[PDB]
Amino acid sequence: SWEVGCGAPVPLVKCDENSPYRTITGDCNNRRSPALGAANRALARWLPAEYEDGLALPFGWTQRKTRNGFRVPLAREVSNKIVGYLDEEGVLDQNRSLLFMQWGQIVDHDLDFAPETELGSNEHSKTQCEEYCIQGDNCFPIMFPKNDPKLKTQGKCMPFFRAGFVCPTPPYQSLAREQINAVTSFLDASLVYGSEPSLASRLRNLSSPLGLMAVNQEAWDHGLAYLPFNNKKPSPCEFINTTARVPCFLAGDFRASEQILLATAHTLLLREHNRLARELKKLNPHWNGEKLYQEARKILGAFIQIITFRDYLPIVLGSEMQKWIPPYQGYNNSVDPRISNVFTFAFRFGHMEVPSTVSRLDENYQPWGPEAELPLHTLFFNTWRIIKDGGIDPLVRGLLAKKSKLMNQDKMVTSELRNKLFQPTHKIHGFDLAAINLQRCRDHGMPGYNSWRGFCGLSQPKTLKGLQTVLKNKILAKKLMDLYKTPDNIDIWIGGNAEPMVERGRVGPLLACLLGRQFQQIRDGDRFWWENPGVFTEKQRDSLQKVSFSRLICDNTHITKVPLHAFQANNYPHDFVDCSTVDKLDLSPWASREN
Ligand code: HEM
Ligand SMILES: *[C@@H]1O[C@H](CO)[C@@H](O[C@@H]2O[C@H](CO)[C@@H](O)[C@H](O)[C@H]2NC(C)=O)[C@H](O)[C@H]1NC(C)=O
Ligand SMILES: *[C@@H]1O[C@H](CO)[C@@H](O)[C@H](O)[C@H]1NC(C)=O
Ligand SMILES: *[C@@H]1O[C@H](CO)[C@@H](O)[C@H](O)[C@H]1NC(C)=O
Ligand SMILES: *[C@@H]1O[C@H](CO)[C@@H](O)[C@H](O)[C@H]1NC(C)=O
Ligand SMILES: [Ca+2]
Ligand SMILES: [Cl-]
Ligand SMILES: [K+]
Ligand SMILES: [Zn+2]
Ligand SMILES: [Zn+2]
């Protein structure tokens, strides 16, 4: 509320109700309500927003005001007391590859983005936020608690800007502030193609009628394509090494260069689109560039859907997968396809799955040169290590043969993210993702832990002893009670991630319910779901069933040895097979003549 920094460009389109292709914006998916799931609309509210003043001020804004008669603890203080840890020894997930973590961030970026208020460029506002730590309007700074080492080294706060929100509309009657989702709620490879028509065009190769995506013209990975550079200045990717001066990539998603392995996955996905386009041109020489672009985009979309639902969700949801995502029963136009506000916090479980280092491995999956293993923080907004230090293959090998961090109640978020995060506007490896997540929960008017437990039909702990029983952890429950005083005030991000994981899963009960419900809606509410009859032919669906991440790697790198099950922990060579033994995508069912 209070209009400073609101709204988004929602362009009005007339719907082609008979197109066999998704729109870029996600409009026209639901025929009765064409905006359901589209980009640049409010996140859905599963529960009503909870603000300090009932409208827009987050809990923790006014020093006098309590939440249920208790002060809310500082975000940085929750992080210091509970989220940090020293010893990286034995922290690794023994049955999840690093690809497990990385695929999570990919799916998340496809589904939701809540961009920070653009106070504008040229800002004295940025100055009063970063330099003077002054709370007001969109500046909601993360204040350091007493004894914080960052007090001695950085200043009084980390700067923090409130998320974008819907503009008050001409009734202008009093409503709770609603944050915007800038990407399509559909699992539709929007992170490759864009959620905005203008960027979608700019990303395409329109010089040739071959339906390709634009590729870098200054740099090649032993003949394989790189994403184009984003030429917008100043560049955070240039800032982290001004000698090398390699800019950030330009992708369908603003966040693609945030860390080197995300950039890697974006590169693999772009290569696959061009491979699909080239193969379809061979099968159908009469097909034009639009047709080729849309058909490759339509396949890559299904690829993301199949990998997510067949390979990823089962090993996240474990025993709860069947309860929340039973067998598909066809498209239901009454299901809400939109991403909920709470989901964008629930999926941040992945921040406890990121380890402290990244490795480049050689063709024998051995340490690649003398600086093989690098600290994660050196790789935020880092494109020069790809362009000028061996391409993506050595990073992709590390994705296969290295492990995700395991979530640990005593070891939650590696110091690489908790103390050394780099933000694209700022100059320091000095931010705390855990403190930002907690601040952001409050920014977004999140109901509290016991609110969501109830939403999920779970018991709502009210005492120390009750919380100890939910967490199966005496000390964690005590630290939480000392900070929050009531489990009612525990911010959903820490509350959900504190719970011991469900059987065969990587999240606890509350997160299994919130994620499960959302992924059920993402499938059932999507008119272009790959299994919805008439989206693909039956023969095309038989072809699609054989896709794998292992094949993506074989088709789009010079790696010739890969595991069959890329998401579990895999050791070279015992667990790796030659690419020739891995099922391919049979494209003959897309062959199209007139006779
Ligand atoms: C750097 C960051 C990562 C890795 C080194 C990382 C990783 C993940 C994984 C693995 C996720 C899911 C399985 C995931 C989800 C979401 N993230 Fe997170 N992430 C890194 C950095 C960030 C930053 C910075 C943000 C924004 C924080 C803010 O509130 O201001 C962030 C957010 C999210 C998020 C909300 C929507 C989005 O931007 O993705 C997730 C669902 N991540 N990350
Ligand atoms: C757009 O597509 C065209 C045609 O495929 C690309 O052009 C060629 O690029 C390759 C690699 O640079 C060369 O080996 C060919 O000799 C080029 N052919 C022509 C017609 O010039 C072009 O580079 C693509 N553009 C972008 C930005 O990706
Ligand atoms: C790793 O997880 C997968 C889950 O589908 C399972 O098939 C495999 O046997 C597991 N390995 C373990 C638990 O060591
Ligand atoms: C910057 O990149 C160059 C090569 O371009 C390398 O030799 C140097 O170590 C890098 N510097 C930093 C600050 O990482
Ligand atoms: C479709 O959606 C609505 C709301 O989710 C639900 O009441 C109904 O049972 C569903 N119908 C079918 C046919 O699955
Ligand atoms: Ca999407
Ligand atoms: Cl919500
Ligand atoms: K992110
Ligand atoms: Zn090569
Ligand atoms: Zn700064």
Automatic annotation (TrEMBL):
GO CC terms: basolateral plasma membrane; cytoplasm; extracellular space
Residues that hold Zn(2+) according to the record: H222, H558
Family: Belongs to the peroxidase family. XPO subfamily.
Enzyme type, top EC level: oxidoreductase
GO terms under biological process: antibacterial humoral response; detection of chemical stimulus involved in sensory perception of bitter taste; hydrogen peroxide catabolic process; response to oxidative stress
GO molecular function, one term: heme binding
EC number per UniProt: 1.11.1.7
Catalytic activity: iodide + H2O2 = hypoiodite + H2O; 2 a phenolic donor + H2O2 = 2 a phenolic radical donor + 2 H2O; thiocyanate + H2O2 + H(+) = hypothiocyanous acid + H2O
Protein's organism: Bos mutus
Cysteines engaged in disulfide bonds, as pairs: C6-C167, C15-C28, C129-C139, C133-C157, C237-C248, C456-C513, C554-C579
Positions where Phosphoserine occurs in the chain: S198
Binding residues annotated for Ca(2+), in chain numbering: D110, T184, F186, D188, S190
Sequence positions that bind heme b: H351
Cellular compartments annotated: Cytoplasm; Secreted
Chain positions carrying an annotated carbohydrate: N95, N205, N241, N332
Cofactor(s) in the UniProt record: heme b; Ca(2+)
Keyword Signal set for record: yes
Residues the record lists as binding heme b 2: H109, R255, R348, H351, R440
Keywords on record: Antibiotic, Antimicrobial, Calcium, Cytoplasm, Disulfide bond, Heme, Hydrogen peroxide, Iron, Metal-binding, Nitration, Oxidoreductase, Peroxidase, Phosphoprotein, Secreted, Signal, Zinc
UniProt: heme b 1 binding residues: Q105, D108, A114, E258, R348, H351, R440
Name recorded for this polypeptide: Lactoperoxidase
Keyword Iron: yes
Location of this fragment in the whole protein: 118 to 712 of 712
